[PDB]
Amino acid sequence: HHWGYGKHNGPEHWHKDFPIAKGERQSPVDIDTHTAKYDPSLKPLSVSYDQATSLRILNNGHAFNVEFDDSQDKAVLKGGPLDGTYRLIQFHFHWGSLDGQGSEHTVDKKKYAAELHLVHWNTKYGDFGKAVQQPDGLAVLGIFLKVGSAKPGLQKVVDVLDSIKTKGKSADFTNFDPRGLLPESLDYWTYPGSLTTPPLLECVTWIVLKEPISVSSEQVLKFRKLNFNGEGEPEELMVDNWRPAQPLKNRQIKASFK
């Protein structure tokens, strides 16, 4: 497979290799704030990242992933809409060429500069590969980024990007604390959806925080210096690596807050 974000291999083409691209629970979606309903039965969200063990950062030619040790329950997401325990495996971002675009989810059609995805898998399925074959296999925590003040907790990420410029490059990335990427409030919207990249599997409970984080123009500018291409190939800047909003179909977005 040779999918990407360009004219010739972008989201409009994905359905030919990945027919589930036109499925019934695809992501992302527009979150219409006047149609999402407060759900008083949602339990409180529990983000337990105190023992998180980051290992490595990888440019995979689509984004960069910060990878965690998920061999035990070190960093987990529980509560909210979730049953059981979901283990953090990696985070990555989607971003734009310009500050007015970049997020995958939109809020009343508003696009943010970027979107962070913290990816967790359901431990009742034993491993990540098994979990993605299940409708409740993954829980992705989605956080919007807007351009304003710098995010101190992001700077370690920004500063390693020079060392993973091109596809297939990785760097050691130990002792990074993903708690520094969270906003103050954990108010969220939730709905059932999919991976937003091939293979687009319909295995995700999406939990999208209402409060964006602010990052600086300098910080996001450094995301935009990454490359989709490998070393010694023609330079294609890693920008606009976001899939646009997909049909909501027969789904309801629930709000954790009134």
Ligand SMILES: O=C(O)Cc1ccc(OCc2ccccc2)cc1
């Ligand atoms: O957070 C996102 O963008 C969704 C997302 C989360 C995890 C992810 O992992 C890669 C992958 C999953 C299944 C099969 C092959 C590759 C791919 C997409």
Ligand SMILES: [Zn+2]
């Ligand atoms: Zn993502």
